[PDB]
Design a protein around this ligand. Sequence first.
Ligand SMILES: *[C@@H]1O[C@H](CO)[C@@H](O[C@@H]2O[C@H](CO)[C@@H](O[C@@H]3O[C@H](CO[C@H]4O[C@H](CO)[C@@H](O)[C@H](O)[C@@H]4O)[C@@H](O)[C@H](O[C@H]4O[C@H](CO)[C@@H](O)[C@H](O)[C@@H]4O)[C@@H]3O)[C@H](O)[C@H]2NC(C)=O)[C@H](O[C@@H]2O[C@@H](C)[C@@H](O)[C@@H](O)[C@@H]2O)[C@H]1NC(C)=O
Ligand SMILES: *[C@@H]1O[C@H](CO)[C@@H](O[C@@H]2O[C@H](CO)[C@@H](O[C@@H]3O[C@H](CO)[C@@H](O)[C@H](O)[C@@H]3O)[C@H](O)[C@H]2NC(C)=O)[C@H](O[C@@H]2O[C@@H](C)[C@@H](O)[C@@H](O)[C@@H]2O)[C@H]1NC(C)=O
Ligand SMILES: *[C@@H]1O[C@H](CO)[C@@H](O[C@@H]2O[C@H](CO)[C@@H](O[C@@H]3O[C@H](CO)[C@@H](O)[C@H](O)[C@@H]3O)[C@H](O)[C@H]2NC(C)=O)[C@H](O[C@@H]2O[C@@H](C)[C@@H](O)[C@@H](O)[C@@H]2O)[C@H]1NC(C)=O
Ligand SMILES: *[C@@H]1O[C@H](CO)[C@@H](O[C@@H]2O[C@H](CO)[C@@H](O)[C@H](O)[C@H]2NC(C)=O)[C@H](O[C@@H]2O[C@@H](C)[C@@H](O)[C@@H](O)[C@@H]2O)[C@H]1NC(C)=O
Ligand SMILES: *[C@@H]1O[C@H](CO)[C@@H](O[C@@H]2O[C@H](CO)[C@@H](O)[C@H](O)[C@H]2NC(C)=O)[C@H](O[C@@H]2O[C@@H](C)[C@@H](O)[C@@H](O)[C@@H]2O)[C@H]1NC(C)=O
Ligand SMILES: CCC/C=C\CC/C=C\C=C\CO[C@@H](c1cccc2ccccc12)P(=O)(O)O
Ligand SMILES: *[C@@H]1O[C@H](CO)[C@@H](O)[C@H](O)[C@H]1NC(C)=O
Ligand SMILES: *[C@@H]1O[C@H](CO)[C@@H](O)[C@H](O)[C@H]1NC(C)=O
Ligand SMILES: *[C@@H]1O[C@H](CO)[C@@H](O)[C@H](O)[C@H]1NC(C)=O
Ligand SMILES: *[C@@H]1O[C@H](CO)[C@@H](O)[C@H](O)[C@H]1NC(C)=O
Ligand SMILES: [Fe+3]
Ligand SMILES: [Fe+3]
Ligand SMILES: [Fe+3]
Ligand SMILES: [Fe+3]
Ligand code: NA
Ligand code: NA
Ligand code: NA
Ligand code: NA
Ligand code: NA
Ligand SMILES: [Zn+2]
Ligand SMILES: [Zn+2]
Ligand SMILES: [Zn+2]
Ligand SMILES: [Zn+2]
Lengths: 423, 424, 425, 423
Amino acid sequence: RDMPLDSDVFRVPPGYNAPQQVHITQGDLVGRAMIISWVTMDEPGSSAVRYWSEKNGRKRIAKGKMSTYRFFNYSSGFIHHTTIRKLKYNTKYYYEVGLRNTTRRFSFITPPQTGLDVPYTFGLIGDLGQSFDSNTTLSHYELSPKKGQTVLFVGDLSYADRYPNHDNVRWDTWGRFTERSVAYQPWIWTAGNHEIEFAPEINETEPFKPFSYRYHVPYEASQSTSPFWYSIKRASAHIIVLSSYSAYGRGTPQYTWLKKELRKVKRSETPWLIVLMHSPLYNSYNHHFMEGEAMRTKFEAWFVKYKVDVVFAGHVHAYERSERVSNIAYKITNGLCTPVKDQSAPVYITIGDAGNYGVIDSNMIQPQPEYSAFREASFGHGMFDIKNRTHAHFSWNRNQDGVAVEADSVWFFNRHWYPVDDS
Amino acid sequence: NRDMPLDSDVFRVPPGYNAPQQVHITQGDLVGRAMIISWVTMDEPGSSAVRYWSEKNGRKRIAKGKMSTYRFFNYSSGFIHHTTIRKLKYNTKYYYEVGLRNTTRRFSFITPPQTGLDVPYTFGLIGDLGQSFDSNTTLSHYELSPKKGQTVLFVGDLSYADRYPNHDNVRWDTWGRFTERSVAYQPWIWTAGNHEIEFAPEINETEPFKPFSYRYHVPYEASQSTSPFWYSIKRASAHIIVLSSYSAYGRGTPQYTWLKKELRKVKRSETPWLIVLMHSPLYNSYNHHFMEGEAMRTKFEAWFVKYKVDVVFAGHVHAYERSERVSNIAYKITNGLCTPVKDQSAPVYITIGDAGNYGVIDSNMIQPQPEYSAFREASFGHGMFDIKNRTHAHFSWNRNQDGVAVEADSVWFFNRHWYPVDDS
Amino acid sequence: NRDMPLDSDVFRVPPGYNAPQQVHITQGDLVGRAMIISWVTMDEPGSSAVRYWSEKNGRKRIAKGKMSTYRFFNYSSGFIHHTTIRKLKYNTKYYYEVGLRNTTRRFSFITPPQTGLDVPYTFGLIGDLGQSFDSNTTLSHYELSPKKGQTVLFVGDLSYADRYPNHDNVRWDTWGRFTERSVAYQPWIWTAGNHEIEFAPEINETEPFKPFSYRYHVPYEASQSTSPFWYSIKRASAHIIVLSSYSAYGRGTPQYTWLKKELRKVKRSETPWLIVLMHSPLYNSYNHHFMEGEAMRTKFEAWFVKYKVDVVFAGHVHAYERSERVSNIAYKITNGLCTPVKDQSAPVYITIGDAGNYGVIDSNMIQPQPEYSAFREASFGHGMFDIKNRTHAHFSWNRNQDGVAVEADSVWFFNRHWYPVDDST
Amino acid sequence: NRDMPLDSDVFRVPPGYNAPQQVHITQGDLVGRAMIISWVTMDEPGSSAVRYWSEKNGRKRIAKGKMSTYRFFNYSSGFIHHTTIRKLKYNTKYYYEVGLRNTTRRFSFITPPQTGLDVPYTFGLIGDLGQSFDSNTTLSHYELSPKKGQTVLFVGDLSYADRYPNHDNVRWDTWGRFTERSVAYQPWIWTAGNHEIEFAPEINETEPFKPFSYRYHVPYEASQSTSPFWYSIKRASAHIIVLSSYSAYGRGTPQYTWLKKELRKVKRSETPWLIVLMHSPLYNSYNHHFMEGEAMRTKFEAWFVKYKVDVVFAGHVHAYERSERVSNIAYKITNGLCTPVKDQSAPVYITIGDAGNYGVIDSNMIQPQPEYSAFREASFGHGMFDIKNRTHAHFSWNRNQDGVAVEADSVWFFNRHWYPVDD
Ligand SMILES: *[C@@H]1O[C@H](CO)[C@@H](O[C@@H]2O[C@H](CO)[C@@H](O[C@@H]3O[C@H](CO[C@H]4O[C@H](CO)[C@@H](O)[C@H](O)[C@@H]4O)[C@@H](O)[C@H](O[C@H]4O[C@H](CO)[C@@H](O)[C@H](O)[C@@H]4O)[C@@H]3O)[C@H](O)[C@H]2NC(C)=O)[C@H](O[C@@H]2O[C@@H](C)[C@@H](O)[C@@H](O)[C@@H]2O)[C@H]1NC(C)=O
Ligand SMILES: *[C@@H]1O[C@H](CO)[C@@H](O[C@@H]2O[C@H](CO)[C@@H](O[C@@H]3O[C@H](CO)[C@@H](O)[C@H](O)[C@@H]3O)[C@H](O)[C@H]2NC(C)=O)[C@H](O[C@@H]2O[C@@H](C)[C@@H](O)[C@@H](O)[C@@H]2O)[C@H]1NC(C)=O
Ligand SMILES: *[C@@H]1O[C@H](CO)[C@@H](O[C@@H]2O[C@H](CO)[C@@H](O[C@@H]3O[C@H](CO)[C@@H](O)[C@H](O)[C@@H]3O)[C@H](O)[C@H]2NC(C)=O)[C@H](O[C@@H]2O[C@@H](C)[C@@H](O)[C@@H](O)[C@@H]2O)[C@H]1NC(C)=O
Ligand SMILES: *[C@@H]1O[C@H](CO)[C@@H](O[C@@H]2O[C@H](CO)[C@@H](O)[C@H](O)[C@H]2NC(C)=O)[C@H](O[C@@H]2O[C@@H](C)[C@@H](O)[C@@H](O)[C@@H]2O)[C@H]1NC(C)=O
Ligand SMILES: *[C@@H]1O[C@H](CO)[C@@H](O[C@@H]2O[C@H](CO)[C@@H](O)[C@H](O)[C@H]2NC(C)=O)[C@H](O[C@@H]2O[C@@H](C)[C@@H](O)[C@@H](O)[C@@H]2O)[C@H]1NC(C)=O
Ligand SMILES: CCC/C=C\CC/C=C\C=C\CO[C@@H](c1cccc2ccccc12)P(=O)(O)O
Ligand SMILES: *[C@@H]1O[C@H](CO)[C@@H](O)[C@H](O)[C@H]1NC(C)=O
Ligand SMILES: *[C@@H]1O[C@H](CO)[C@@H](O)[C@H](O)[C@H]1NC(C)=O
Ligand SMILES: *[C@@H]1O[C@H](CO)[C@@H](O)[C@H](O)[C@H]1NC(C)=O
Ligand SMILES: *[C@@H]1O[C@H](CO)[C@@H](O)[C@H](O)[C@H]1NC(C)=O
Ligand SMILES: [Fe+3]
Ligand SMILES: [Fe+3]
Ligand SMILES: [Fe+3]
Ligand SMILES: [Fe+3]
Ligand code: NA
Ligand code: NA
Ligand code: NA
Ligand code: NA
Ligand code: NA
Ligand SMILES: [Zn+2]
Ligand SMILES: [Zn+2]
Ligand SMILES: [Zn+2]
Ligand SMILES: [Zn+2]
């Protein structure tokens, strides 16, 4: 059910060495920078980006870096990453890539300065892939009347590793497929299990290597030492990105980094505290049941202590929304191992249902446990619409429905500013 | 601070120009016919060649290895040598010499017998050794033990150098000179503890395990691991699996992938004793680090029960603990089944992190003793796991405050694959 | 453009999934007991293992090598294998196979005799081969020669890939497949010429010799050299020194220092024939590249006369020339002694860069012929240096326009150490 | 052995925890608007940031650089810093501070005037300095010169550390601390000499120039060179070309290709003084190293005469010599033209390698003095190249055994392009 190589979403931009696979993401901690990325195939080309605002018209030049990789018998094109900085808040910019031979032009809109009551709309996509179901989801997100401004991506991008020798041409087609969205607004990248690409059978043993070459993130801005975990702030949201498939024992980099990062969170500057990871801590589907238990034993209590608002995960090819629960009182011999209602706790949302290679996960644990509010095996995407410091509106759109229909929808009440029960 | 001062006898430098120091050895292949020979020269790079011969044939041979150096903050290492001797005869005494160019030092070892069903072998068990005065006593009790251990299973936390300002790596060098009087003559099987992480971004040192990994090499490619921090070796009648508590082990990760495949390769008709080393215990009823093992346990415990692992050795708690054979693999979030139960199909869990560290014992325990815990005591000591044949092994625990020959705890193991009768 | 087109037969891809191509061997040690097996696989990395066994005995062994890859501008290479077979027996035919995982191909070679005073041996001389039609004829003439070459001495300028846009490295791949029919069966000894430099900052390739050095390894550590671009080998009764015209050679440089110590190690009582290979000729009365060899001459000529080198072979000039034994080492800036004189202690200097290149011959000569030049002609062809015993070696030049058994020029060398007698024509 | 012992005053270590030592500066760009600031910290890495401000305005700014280390045999370097200050103002005195994190130290320099046809400027000429007692005298004589030199052209052989056992690299550190009293306040232009090669395969140091290149950076990319060992700069009314006696220079090599194109760039109406620096002299009538420079001469002498180089400076020979204006470029093997002739498009060749090395002079001279030799003497000292304007520059030679204001040799240079009078 994967879209064939000659499909229109995979068409190659014309002209000698025309930039392709253009994508952007937030380039700094607070919103005043952007990482511009693209691939040229005919020759290395230039790493310069030319950009200007609608307001100023003044054209400046940023210069970045070019890298390549091989994977088994595949040889990549020339990958460019360039960071434009010191931009102005709430402003439309133009930028151009391919300055040596074939120039292409795009644009983006910076976010507002971070603040307590700054509204903002986030799209939620996981496990996208490049099947036909993938294409419908992206169309539905594009036509959403709520107008997403940034995508939080919860992992599993191209599913290129399902192909023989992980055929990396399928990374390239995915790069051209998603451009019509991610060249114009930032997507925030989370690493999933399909990015690992651990294949000693063909002497490819560097974890995450193709993903890490193609998708860069601003991980030093939060003083992280790896791209696989980091945070950013945008409008009124503090977003914490975690890596299910890196080390998180006591004393490791990721564990040490998270414990320090939660202490920097300021709820009167960014009241919406959002965590992303690939593998769900709370999951009542049969597929991948209880895989999140390990990370859950390390981090769940931290999430409650700091009153995290919501945790988004993918990995399960379906949709689920948890009640506000915690399961943090167990001590081996006390028998306290059942989740309980907890108004300091986040809501757990699984949203890894954007299409993958065309398969849904429909088997569920019966009966639905108390901790599960809503679950359904349908393709689609989510929208997390922040109105202000007390209220945010979440809605789930199905591919079989109209682009304006919401099959699930709920108001989030802020854990710090308005911790009402929101069942 | 009960650390031995820098001018202690155990820290003396071997005299002579560019005299090799910190000499240590470990198994260098899958099945016992190779040895990794390691040492440090401090005056100049020197030769990485090892001269060696068997007592049986007396033919001097030469093996060439590699030299490396590292830096950590404002410390610069000496010249680190690693050399693999190969194609050794089983059950044979060998001599070896390092420092062939200026000052030469000679040592010896004995290869194991070939892997087989009823091949006896005595493994020492040492965890969280350190370089305090208690560490020296433990080491003396081991080398003086009438059971005579042939190989040390080391469950992590080596030098404790990371407790010093800037992780003063001089305390790695001292520890190497202290342990030489044992590890130069018999292999130690290295596990990576949390004191080896040395993650210190405040001084721009962000590569985990860097000092440990430059100084202590392991034969990880022989079991097709891709990392020195998990791997497998076979010796006599044992299959030893080494794990990394502070690497990734999520489903799909390198370590998870390797362990799933490796348990399937275990041939209990060749090595009947399946033994797992890791730093952080899965079962532990002391207050200190209580439940830090929960994460790894949810990932790997059902596998250990499935493949009838005989015993799991851990450290990290500074004390001794021996569990019953228990499991806790029936939990399903909402079914309330979360109390360990007796399970004669499960390994024994032993904590043996009490060789000395920096002079501090972990004496606070959860009371009353839980049903899963068989024996526990807060005393310094070491362990011995003495294989007799395919069905019987004998474990003993020796306390620093007893005579070298006094066993304070001891128990017979009945092999989970060849003889699974209640040994509780 | 007289370069052979891409679909020529000499460029045909060996059939079969991941079949090895561009197979070539060279001597892999100082004395002749080793051989470096090199080849490229185009579909996936494959195995670096070489299976090999001797024709008479036949116990099959495996040797394991290494694989590497490189990029040049927007060209990406396939998978390059280099594998050293050691501890061979002298004067023995060996079989060997490559491609052990998927498509295997089998070849063979004959180890040299053990080094010794009177060991006969036959060396081909080829320079500036390229891949034109003229190139094909010369290689044809060499492989058909009655004298039966057992090793090619190659004085530099291999593929001429750098004449193509962006140095189209595909033209390295074809040249490998074209030369395979000789170099997979007998070692070629490699010298680095000015077309291997491939210095092209305009496309950000600033590492001299990158494609050449990835594809052709040499046993350079065996003579205590620190660079592949200069080294020494012994083979039968010859001691061969390979130098680098386009590397440093000032006093105190690595190459200078290495040649100095290497000339001391030469023992003419063990290997009587002392042979030097370099790309740019020290003595050259053709007009193309006239006097480029002067800088290296001022450094090394006196050393050649001192050590009584028998012969110096060079290329670069797309024609043939053979000098008289002469020297020019008495100049002191103001004493006026700047003319070459006859010197029975000096080597013969032979330019042999006429194997074909891209089809052009250098016919502009300085006139009249200088007294330092014995014979010269602007024709394509190749040479043979045919060693008989410790006193006699026969050099001959075969033209492409002649029968393969015809020598258009031919001279008997009398050994400078064992028969130090005037041997001029 | 007349080298200064380790406890000499000139080798004292700046006091205080991790105080910068071995501070040295050089030109950081092509035209004079930038400066490379270099120093060593011995107790811990420290910061590579430099603080600098003009004496005029005084707006303080920070430039960030790069720390590196090396090993040589059993030696382990300290922490070496290189930091480029850019966009400086012409003809302006600046202050700079290094060591910001712990012990700070403060120095100053004066940027040159803008390049131009008639800018005056005074260059000191020092060669083969080393660290003998004679070395200390020459550096005193240069510092005290009434001519007041503003930038040193250093023609190679720096520390002579390679004469010690295993090239005791401590002797680089001592030399660094000794020369600091001049080179921290005004730039020195580095040329590589044979004592910088440090090729010692018998202790597996086989990378040519390794300690030298770590310790002394040059702005080589600003002239499109691919190597630090050949490069060019412009300062005031001079165009300075630095060449590498012990790198490759055959036809088609990188340095050959660079020099050929670089000479095509010189413009004598912007910079009328065309100066070439190299270590091994092309004209030398002393016995030590006689005719060592023939090889480079066969490749480059004709180019020097074709582009009318004013003066060529070299060292290597521990003495002084000034040549007549001659060339020896007509030789064609059989035509017999091998004697040098007066040539008024040729440069003057000056050997200035007599600053002290380790205390030995080269006194054995070829007799009688050849015609191409104007003046020669075997005594320690230094030179001065004092440019008055586009037609005139004045060269003088000061000997260590004279007062700091006596010139034992002296001559006017008439510019080859603007005023080619027989001199
Ligand atoms: C695999 O290893 C295990 C561990 O070593 C083996 O188990 C041991 O087996 C040995 C026998 O080989 C046992 O030792 C023997 O014990 C008997 C009984 O001792 C008790 O009762 C005596 C009165 O009869 C009393 O005097 C004594 O103090 C004790 O309380 C001894 O009688 C015996 O000594 C006499 O016989 C030997 C043999 O000829 C003579 O040499 C002596 O001179 C004496 O006259 C001997 O010491 C030992 O108890 C076992 N250990 C354990 C922990 O069970 C195992 O052996 C196998 O399994 C055991 C369970 C038995 O079935 C053995 O028969 C059997 O071989 C090893 N497996 C194999 C296949 O070998
Ligand atoms: C070393 O190698 C040289 C070159 O091959 C030998 O010289 C050659 O010796 C051949 C005899 O072995 C000569 O061939 C004969 O010529 C005669 C007269 O024309 C014929 O009747 C006869 O049938 C052969 O064809 C050959 O001419 C000669 N070549 C040269 C260039 O001189 C040399 O042999 C030694 O020197 C020569 C001059 C003779 O005296 C030989 O007998 C003598 O042994 C070889 N050296 C040794 C020690 O064998
Ligand atoms: C690596 O960096 C550490 C941390 O700075 C160095 O240790 C420090 O050395 C300083 C000496 O420069 C000490 O400061 C002095 O302490 C003495 C003793 O009280 C006082 O009299 C004096 O006035 C200074 O304050 C500093 O206390 C010390 N800090 C720590 C945490 O140990 C280390 O230096 C090495 O160790 C010290 C103890 C001395 O022996 C040094 O000379 C020695 O090199 C640095 N190591 C290296 C190899 O550079
Ligand atoms: C934050 O946004 C919320 C959603 O837009 C606001 O609540 C909405 O307020 C409307 C008129 O103020 C009312 O008609 C809507 O029904 C209501 N929606 C919901 C889900 O309550 C909210 O306004 C404040 O909070 C609510 C609870 C009322 O008390 C309003 O009168 C308040 O002004 C916004 N909060 C703030 C602080 O702006
Ligand atoms: C460039 O500087 C030269 C050195 O000072 C000038 O020559 C000097 O001019 C002085 C007049 O101010 C005169 O007294 C000095 O004797 C003379 N010095 C020498 C060594 O000749 C030079 O001046 C021009 O050129 C010379 C040849 C004379 O014709 C002067 O009168 C000229 O002004 C300066 N050149 C220029 C273009 O300014
Ligand atoms: C618990 C997370 C890490 C916090 C600090 C790191 C350890 C710093 C110094 C050494 C302490 C003693 O060592 C033990 C230990 C290790 C780790 C922590 C402890 C805390 C208290 C006592 C002993 C703790 P251990 O790892 O050897 O079993
Ligand atoms: C993908 O979706 C877009 C927009 O809905 C549509 O125009 C395009 O034809 C689709 N392509 C495929 C291959 O489904
Ligand atoms: C280096 O080696 C020399 C030669 O023996 C020795 O004298 C010197 O002290 C050594 N220095 C260091 C820093 O190891
Ligand atoms: C350590 O133990 C050994 C052996 O028991 C003893 O000889 C030595 O003196 C002890 N040293 C210290 C510092 O305790
Ligand atoms: C280092 O070079 C020396 C010089 O002889 C040599 O003995 C030694 O083996 C070399 N080490 C290598 C190539 O690893
Ligand atoms: Fe998925
Ligand atoms: Fe510990
Ligand atoms: Fe050529
Ligand atoms: Fe000198
Ligand atoms: Na842990
Ligand atoms: Na032996
Ligand atoms: Na997992
Ligand atoms: Na040349
Ligand atoms: Na020289
Ligand atoms: Zn997944
Ligand atoms: Zn621990
Ligand atoms: Zn050429
Ligand atoms: Zn010199």
